[PDB]
Amino acid sequence: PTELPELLKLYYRRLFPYSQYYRWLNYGGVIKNYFQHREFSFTLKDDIYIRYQSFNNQSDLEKEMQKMNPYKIDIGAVYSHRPNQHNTVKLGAFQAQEKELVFDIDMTDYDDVRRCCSSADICPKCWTLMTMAIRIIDRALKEDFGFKHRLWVYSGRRGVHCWVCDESVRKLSSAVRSGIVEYLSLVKGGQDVKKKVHLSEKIHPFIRKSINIIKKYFEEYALVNQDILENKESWDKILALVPETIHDELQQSFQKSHNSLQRWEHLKKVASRYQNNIKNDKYGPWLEWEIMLQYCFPRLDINVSKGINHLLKSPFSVHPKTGRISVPIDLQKVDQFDPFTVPTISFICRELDAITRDYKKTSLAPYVKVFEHFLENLDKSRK
Ligand SMILES: Nc1nc(F)nc2c1ncn2[C@@H]1O[C@H](COP(=O)(O)OP(=O)(O)OP(=O)(O)O)[C@@H](O)[C@H]1O
C-alpha cells in the first residue's frame, strides 16, 4: 500500500489512456460544456477524497491527475454548472442533469449460493456467475431496451460494471432508471428470506430468454464446479426452495443417486409433477426455473443504478485493494475473460521498462483496444 504512490506516478505519466478517455467523456464535443460540467472525485492517501472536481479540457485533466496521483478516480454526473464552482452557484440551482446509466455487480451478493468463496474473494469456479450476469443483462439492454452503446468493465476485485452511454439514456430520470432496474430484477429478499424467486404462471420473454442463457452454463457451473447437490448439507439448501410435500421423495432419490448430475434430473422430474393449484390440472417447470434463477441470475447493486448523482469507479482506475486496473471486457470473448490475468499497476510498470514508453508496450494494450472499439461505435453513431 506504500508502493502505490511511486507506481501511480508512472502510470499517470506514461500509461493512462488520456486521449481515449477524453474522447469518451467529451462525447464528440457536440454539447456545450458537457466535459467541463462533469464531476470527478479523487481518492488520495488515507481514504481521503475530494468531491466536485472538474476540468477545462484534456490537458487540464492530465495536469491535475499527474499532480495529485489519486489512488482512485470516480466519475459522477454532468451538472448544470462547473462542479468546481458549485459554491459560487445560488443554492438550489446546482443540479445533476445527465449521467450514463450504470450497473455494479458484486460477487459478494451471491454468497448464499456460492460454495467456493465468500466476502470479496473470487475464483474461476464462481466467476461464471459474472459471465451469466453480463450475458443476461447485456441481452436485455441491447434487445429489449434498444441501447446501443454499452461498456462492460472489470471492477478490479469482485465483479463487473456496465456503462450505458446512448445520448437519450444519459438524460434518463432516476424514476425511469429505477423502472429499468425493476424490469431486470428477479432475486429479491435479504438473508431473512429463504426463497428469493417466485414466478408467475406465464413467464415473460425476458425471463424465458434469461433462463435459456443459464441453461447453457448450469450443468458445468452448478452441478460440477459448485456441486450444489454433492451431499445432504448442500442439497438441503435446495429443498428449502420447494414445497415440503415433495421433500421425502427427493430425499430418497438423492440418497439413491451418485452425483449432482443425477440428483438434478430427479429434481426436475418431481418438480414437473407437483400440483401447485388444485383447481386445475396444470403442471410445469416453475420450481426448476426458480431454483436455477436463485443460484445463477444477476443480482444488481441496485442503488448504484437508481441515482443520477451516484459515483462509480472510472474505467482504467486502479482498485487500491488489489492493484488491478479496472479494464474493459471484450463482449466477443466474455467466456474467456480471466480476472487473474488482469494486469496490476505494478505488473505493467515493470513491463514498461523491462528489457515509445506508452501502454502499447504493456499488457494494458488489448484492453485499450476494446475501449477504442466502443469509442468508434459512439463516433459512428454521431456521424
Ligand atoms: N463511500 C462512498 N461514497 C461515495 F460517494 N461513492 C462511493 C462510496 N463507496 C463506493 N462508492 C462508489 O460506488 C461504486 C461501487 O462501490 P463498490 O462496489 O464497493 O466498488 P467497486 O465496484 O468499484 O469495486 P469492487 O470492490 O466491487 O470490485 C464505487 O466504484 C464508487 O464509485
Ligand SMILES: [Mn+2]
Ligand atoms: Mn462493485
Ligand SMILES: [Mn+2]
Ligand atoms: Mn457495490
Ligand SMILES: [Zn+2]
Ligand atoms: Zn469462487
